[PDB]
Amino acid sequence: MCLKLNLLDHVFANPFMNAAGVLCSTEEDLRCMTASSSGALVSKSCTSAPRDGNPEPRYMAFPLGSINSMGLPNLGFDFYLKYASDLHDYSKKPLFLSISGLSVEENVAMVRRLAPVAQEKGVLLELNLSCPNVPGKPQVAYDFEAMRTYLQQVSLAYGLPFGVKMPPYFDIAHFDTAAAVLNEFPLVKFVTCVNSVGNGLVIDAESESVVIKPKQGFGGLGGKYILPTALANVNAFYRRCPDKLVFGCGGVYSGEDAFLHILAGASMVQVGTALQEEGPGIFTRLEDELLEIMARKGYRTLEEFRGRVKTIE
Amino acid sequence: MCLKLNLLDHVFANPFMNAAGVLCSTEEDLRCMTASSSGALVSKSCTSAPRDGNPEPRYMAFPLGSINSMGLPNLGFDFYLKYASDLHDYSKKPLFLSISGLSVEENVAMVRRLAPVAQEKGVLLELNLSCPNVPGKPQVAYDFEAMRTYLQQVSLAYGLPFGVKMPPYFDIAHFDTAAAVLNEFPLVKFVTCVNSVGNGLVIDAESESVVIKPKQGFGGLGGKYILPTALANVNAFYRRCPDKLVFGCGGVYSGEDAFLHILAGASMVQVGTALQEEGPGIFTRLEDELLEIMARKGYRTLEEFRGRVKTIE
Ligand SMILES: Cc1cc2nc3c(=O)[nH]c(=O)nc-3n(C[C@H](O)[C@H](O)[C@H](O)COP(=O)(O)O)c2cc1C
Ligand SMILES: Cc1cc2nc3c(=O)[nH]c(=O)nc-3n(C[C@H](O)[C@H](O)[C@H](O)COP(=O)(O)O)c2cc1C
Ligand SMILES: COc1cccc(CCc2c(C(=O)O)[nH]c(=O)[nH]c2=O)c1
Ligand SMILES: COc1cccc(CCc2c(C(=O)O)[nH]c(=O)[nH]c2=O)c1
């Protein structure tokens, strides 16, 4: 019985990795993730310049999940490129680098410079589309014309297989349109579903206050709140993009939650909130729990059940 | 101390009512809700003709909430209008009738008939902008030009104060655009935030199956999953629509959860999943729990704290 996968011309001990943004901002964070039992890691979404991000408090967690408005704090592209080019030990596990430029030209400039490191060292790009463009317009993946522009420009500039991190959708028309846009781009080889469920509001009853400072308390939701939303998006894109991989992200706290993602169609399974709360020891637990479910069911590999969710009659 | 309030030229014993679709489809159901301690009730969203809805199973509930693809099963508009005109006892509490025609023309036709019953009896209209998926077209509330048409046509056909049931939004630009649409219509006097979080997917690990039959398992989410989403929408529209009431719906299982909705801006608080799960006794509990929290805080009225959620610096 084994959790091994081979995808995107890389080998993964297991499907688990951090979600972008969690335990991956600094060198220390990345070394931690690399030392962990995860199958892979992804770096913090970066911009060309370093950013301090929003004022604190900007992340809070509770029994059913988390809310954040971090504001994209990161050490800048050059740092993450250096990590990929010179610091990461590729013999431990594969690395993904997430980018989240604030404009199409910022993304273009970064992927141009990432390309030769991707070709030589095998770092994999995750382009964050669940991200701001012009303020007063919707996030890029909620603006299908902007999304198409970003993918056309990045595809031309980068020229290598990459993946995309998508926000959740809630309307079948959006699943259809979004997948049709992605399917225009043969270099988009993986689709990570989902980013945080946007602009939730957590309020603390005793203090009568929101719990994060930015944006009058509005921020993206993760964790137990979002698992059925995550599963729906994984399955919706799994069905609509048969020549791409789907990576699942959202609501994973247990090997059972991971097994659901994989039944829905997930290849890799990313862990955000639960990892932020539990720490990297979660990866040994999740591996053990998923293997126990597989043993009970007589499954020896992930492919035996990936995308095999049953429908009713 | 009592929770009675006056809105829309009606008196309410308390701010609680059922969510449209729950405990409100048949004459039995409407009599049950009338006999409950709720402050008001709303009927099942109706179409001009009766509908059987989708194949079963089409609703399921879990510790953290529910998923449904009911398919607008309903007894038809003539039935609900007859209930409003002849059967309902207005001395007990106010009645809202929810309409969800499958086209603008259907909604126009129904509202032209409701108008004199609204004048004579005081039934209130809640216009549901959500409908079964039509391939190629987004939900009405997610297509701002369609939304503007519906509201223009209904406002003209009806001529009296009404409200609108909204799905959730997840992007600040969308809040801005949606509220600006709504603010074009002075007869829209209340906005109910929110309908179920669309197209989630619940999977059972043991059976490896989805749990509802229609739509390959995809359905709207209610319950604990959606409380922060619901609060964010309530507050976003409370802030943007100062000349309107906001009715909160989503994730209410306790007087604390109701308290948070009211803090966010809610005038009435609607209860769906929890009501479906617990039954109509829930209203006496929610009333007791909300009065208990008020008493611990020193609040004597709902107006003292409605909309008064605090932000940080
Ligand atoms: C503190 C924090 C920072 C995040 N930063 C990023 C980011 O930089 N890029 C990104 O693609 N997603 C980011 N996200 C989203 C996560 O990658 C993940 O999509 C989301 O939290 C849902 O997964 P979960 O339910 O396991 O938390 C962040 C989430 C959290 C909680
Ligand atoms: C079984 C069921 C049927 C519903 N039918 C309707 C409907 O006819 N009209 C409507 O506006 N919303 C309908 N809804 C949505 C609810 O009114 C409510 O917006 C949603 O369930 C969120 O509230 P909750 O978290 O309390 O369940 C339905 C919900 C459920 C669970
Ligand atoms: C630039 O300000 C931003 C506002 C919202 C989202 C983002 C992208 C980064 C990001 C963040 C973040 O850094 O806030 N949090 C998430 O949950 N997902 C994300 O993708 C940037
Ligand atoms: C599958 O049937 C529908 C899909 C979307 C919307 C509607 C309208 C009635 C409705 C329903 C329903 O009857 O399925 N369920 C909801 O959670 N909200 C609603 O507004 C039906």
UniProtKB/Swiss-Prot annotation, chains A, B:
Keywords, comma-separated and alphabetical: Cytoplasm, Flavoprotein, FMN, Oxidoreductase, Pyrimidine biosynthesis
Cofactor note: Binds 1 FMN per subunit.
Residues where FMN binds: 20, 44-45, 128, 165, 194, 223, 250-251, 272-273
Subcellular location per the Swiss-Prot or TrEMBL entry: Cytoplasm
Chaperone found in the keyword field: no
Pathway listed: Pyrimidine metabolism; UMP biosynthesis via de novo pathway
Source domain of life: Eukaryota
Protein name: Dihydroorotate dehydrogenase (fumarate)
Organism field: Trypanosoma cruzi (strain CL Brener)
